[PDB]
Scaffold this active site. Structure first.
Site, PDB file in Angstrom:
ATOM      1  CD  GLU A 142      38.599 -15.061 -17.095  1.00 43.77           C
ATOM      2  OE1 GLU A 142      39.672 -14.968 -16.454  1.00 43.77           O
ATOM      3  OE2 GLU A 142      38.248 -14.195 -17.929  1.00 43.77           O
TER       4      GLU A 142
HETATM    5  O1  LIG Z   1      45.328 -13.868 -15.947  1.00 40.00           O
HETATM    6  C1  LIG Z   1      44.528 -14.918 -16.508  1.00 40.00           C
HETATM    7  C2  LIG Z   1      43.184 -14.349 -16.964  1.00 40.00           C
HETATM    8  C3  LIG Z   1      43.335 -13.339 -18.127  1.00 40.00           C
HETATM    9  O2  LIG Z   1      44.019 -13.904 -19.247  1.00 40.00           O
HETATM   10  C4  LIG Z   1      41.929 -12.972 -18.580  1.00 40.00           C
HETATM   11  O3  LIG Z   1      41.970 -12.216 -19.796  1.00 40.00           O
HETATM   12  C5  LIG Z   1      41.220 -12.121 -17.523  1.00 40.00           C
HETATM   13  O4  LIG Z   1      39.809 -12.258 -17.729  1.00 40.00           O
HETATM   14  C6  LIG Z   1      41.616 -12.583 -16.158  1.00 40.00           C
HETATM   15  N1  LIG Z   1      41.179 -12.079 -14.987  1.00 40.00           N
HETATM   16  C7  LIG Z   1      41.794 -12.755 -13.986  1.00 40.00           C
HETATM   17  C8  LIG Z   1      42.625 -13.689 -14.558  1.00 40.00           C
HETATM   18  N2  LIG Z   1      42.480 -13.586 -15.887  1.00 40.00           N
END
Ligand SMILES: OC[C@@H]1[C@@H](O)[C@H](O)[C@@H](O)c2[nH]cc[n+]21
Length: 489
Positions: free
Chosen positions: A387
């Site tokens: 991510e």
């Molecule tokens: O906040 C944006 C995203 C969430 O939507 C995800 O579900 C989660 O994995 C996460 N960890 C850090 C940032 N995020």
């Protein structure tokens, strides 16, 4: 130009609970999270936003359209999860050889007969639907990382309202070893049913956030929101051994790589006198967890032990990265500072003059280089950036955010770190947990009334990166901080 290896893949990550619901027949009312966000007391306290996931982007029905756009965009990798609650909405029979009173789960035997029994209880409509989704995904030439868990548990395993209220007589989620046992069986079962479609597995997404926000950071409105240092340790202990048993479960059925996805901050010194505070922050927030599942080192009660059942349960590391944390040395130890990282005002500037997102998160791409190189030097396990993204409905900062962080992955590879893909969070807007729909992380904008998807200019920038396997000369200027003068302070 900054070119990536020929085998490197650009893609996206998505969660079931956040993106699936929205179209007719897609509702999954059977999780702790679903009950949590519908709770009247939680709504009145402002713990949750009042937005409801069943009004979401509708990936369950509209997945062919998401996939169409990802393919237009030249994406070549996707990571998403199966929702546990959709596969097993009703309870499973109590397990045999299971002593709920033991602290440690060092083994969960799963054999083919056990799996076929499991199969009797699984929701077939959901199983077939997920197969249809993942098949369509693969048909676009997307490499597929299947994650088993991304926060919501089946209600039969966790009633978070009961727990919030201080009643520990019902299903207690990560506080119970039953959940650890069932998670291992679930993960093995899913690998058994989908291995033909999967390229790599992850057991879970950000277990630290689950234990940290659930039982300490209770203002965040994460279930069960029961404030307890002791229960947070128990939860974290259980989730670690759950990952190890899930790894063994999947491996019993598959030869494919099995990793984990974890939430990372780049710990940054306030002054040149706080370099040790950084190390301590890194110990307390990162290494303790990975040393447990890689080296078997864990604290059980008061004793620091080594568990052979935990050791070596990891093939790869999913790096989730958004921003930094600034720390300073203290008498006691160290403290995180407000006004930097994720502790800033929304749509403003940090104490360092760096712009903040719609979520109040500080722009800090070099943190990603920091995190990737630090994991690499410590463990030498390959990585995906699983991510990275920004709450930015307007799309003011995202084009810079994207090119800048993608540049930092290039930097990391150049330094020798084995990083094999970059997955933006996310393809489209989705339900941001306790914050609801107003935190919009998508490369694609969602109109929640029509469920139509729109290309933010950053989606067009991402297509340039993905289709070329490079930051092209023409977009290289976006490897910079968004100009602050025209933005809100
Ligand atoms: O906040 C944006 C995203 C969430 O939507 C995800 O579900 C989660 O994995 C996460 N960890 C850090 C940032 N995020």
């Amino acid at each position: 130009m900054y070119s990536f290896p020929n085998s490197f893949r650009f893609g996206w990550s998505q969660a079931g609970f956040q993106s699936e619901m929205g179209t007719p027949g897609s509702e999954d009312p059977n999780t702790d999270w679903y009950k949590w966000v519908h709770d009247p007391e939680n709504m009145a306290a402002g713990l949750v936003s009042g937005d409801l996931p069943e009004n979401g982007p509708g990936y369950w029905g509209n997945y062919k359209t998401f996939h169409d756009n990802a393919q237009k965009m030249g994406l070549k990798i996707a990571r998403l999860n199966v929702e546990w609650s959709r596969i097993f909405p009703n309870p499973l029979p109590r397990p045999q050889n299971f002593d709920e009173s033991k602290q440690d789960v060092t083994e969960v035997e799963i054999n083919e007969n056990e799996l076929k029994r499991l199969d009797e209880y699984a929701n077939k409509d959901a199983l077939n639907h997920y197969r249809e989704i993942f098949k369509d995904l693969k048909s676009r030439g997307l490499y597929f990382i299947l994650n088993m868990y991304h926060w919501p548990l089946p209600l039969w395993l966790h009633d978070p309202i009961r727990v919030r209220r201080g009643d520990f007589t019902g299903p207690s989620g990560w506080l119970s070893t039953r959940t650890v046992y069932e998670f291992a069986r679930f993960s093995a079962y899913i690998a058994w049913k989908f291995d033909d479609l999967v390229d790599e597995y992850s057991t879970m997404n950000e277990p630290n956030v689950v234990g940290g926000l659930g039982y300490v950071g209770v203002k965040s409105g994460f279930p069960p929101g029961y404030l307890s240092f002791e229960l947070s340790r128990r939860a974290m202990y259980n989730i670690i051994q759950a990952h190890a048993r899930a790894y063994d479960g999947i491996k019993s059925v598959s030869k494919k790589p099995v990793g984990i996805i974890y939430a990372n901050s780049s710990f940054q010194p306030l002054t040149d006198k706080d370099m040790e505070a950084v190390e301590m922050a890194e110990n307390d927030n990162r290494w303790w967890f990975f040393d447990a599942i890689i080296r078997g080192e864990i604290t059980r009660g008061n004793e620091k032990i080594v568990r052979d059942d935990l050791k070596g349960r990891l093939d790869w590391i999913g790096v989730n990265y958004y921003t930094r944390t600034v720390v300073k040395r203290t008498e006691k130890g160290y403290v995180s500072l407000g006004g930097y990282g994720h502790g800033c005002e929304r749509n403003s500037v940090s104490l360092a003059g760096l712009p903040t997102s719609d979520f109040g998160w500080e722009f800090f791409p070099e943190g990603l280089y920091d995190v990737l190189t630090k994991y690499w030097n410590r463990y030498h396990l390959y990585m995906y950036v699983t991510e990275n993204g920004i709450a930015d409905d307007a799309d003011y900062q995202r084009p810079y955010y994207l090119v800048s962080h993608v540049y930092q992955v290039h930097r990391a590879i150049n330094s020798g770190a084995d990083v094999r893909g970059y997955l933006h969070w996310s393809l489209a807007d989705n339900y941001e947990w306790a914050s609801g729909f107003s935190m919009r992380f998508g490369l694609l904008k969602v109109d929640y009334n029509t469920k139509r998807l729109y290309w933010r200019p950053s989606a067009l920038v991402y297509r340039e990166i993905a289709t070329n396997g490079a930051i092209t000369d023409e977009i290289e200027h976006l490897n910079s901080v968004p100009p602050v003068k025209p933005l809100r302070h």
